[PDB]
Design a protein around this ligand. Structure first.
Ligand SMILES: [Zn+2]
Ligand SMILES: [Zn+2]
Lengths: 135, 151
């Protein structure tokens, strides 16, 4: 059950790393606005965790839309939808640091740094979930 | 052309997603492969090796090799998505294409790519396995584009 969930989390981690790499090379000015407006809303709502969830979804969705691959986006959306349904319940600040490193790498046009920023965000998040469920 | 630009763009997108999934599967397989996984990859590879002059018989073996790697991830979700994606239909057989591919020696080039993934997975080396699996998918998409532009 935690390992049925963990199996989806592993697959999402691989795909999200790839999405950031494609987004690093194919991002539009339109793609940059959606990631930036989601990031600014995420920065505004640091003291309201419940409002921030919509923005984190919007930020990852903007990276997925920046791939310009419909098949890739549909699979990422389906895995993301499955994970939200399965896990129904400095956190504001450390997650913003991880969220910002992906955005800078994508802004730079650097695919390798983007993949590692996106991968590190998923790994640190996974470590936070494992430990929360134990206590 | 056998396929027009929008069919070529959709196909390249499908290979692009397949490329990323194969790279993740090779890395997972490199770390977690057990004695039963090594036997299944070796057996499919031996069969592909034995059928270099018969491209027709090869398809079944190619699916078995990619499927054994997906099993070696030991992630049921990844394995099942890959089993489904590797049943994908391939480009139609043509007398002209079959004659040019033999002169090509396409099967030997492809065997070296299938072989580079097995060697990396056998060596318990994840970055090497991911690099070989991604290269296999990139070359296949590139070969497929040239075939769609040439009939
Ligand atoms: Zn996030
Ligand atoms: Zn193959």
């Amino acid at each position: 059950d935690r390992e049925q969930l963990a199996s989806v989390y592993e697959l999402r981690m691989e795909l999200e790393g790839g999405a950031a790499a494609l987004a690093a090379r194919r991002r539009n000015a339109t793609d940059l606005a959606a990631m930036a407006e989601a990031l600014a809303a995420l920065e505004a709502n640091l003291d309201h965790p419940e409002q921030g969830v919509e923005h984190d979804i919007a930020f990852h969705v903007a990276i997925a839309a920046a791939t310009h691959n419909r098949y890739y986006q549909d699979l990422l959306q389906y895995l993301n939808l499955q994970l939200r349904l399965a896990v129904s319940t400095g956190l504001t600040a450390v997650v913003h640091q991880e969220h910002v490193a992906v955005y800078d790498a994508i802004l730079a046009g650097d695919p390798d740094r983007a993949r590692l920023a996106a991968t590190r965000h998923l790994q640190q998040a996974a470590s936070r979930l494992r430990l929360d469920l134990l206590s």
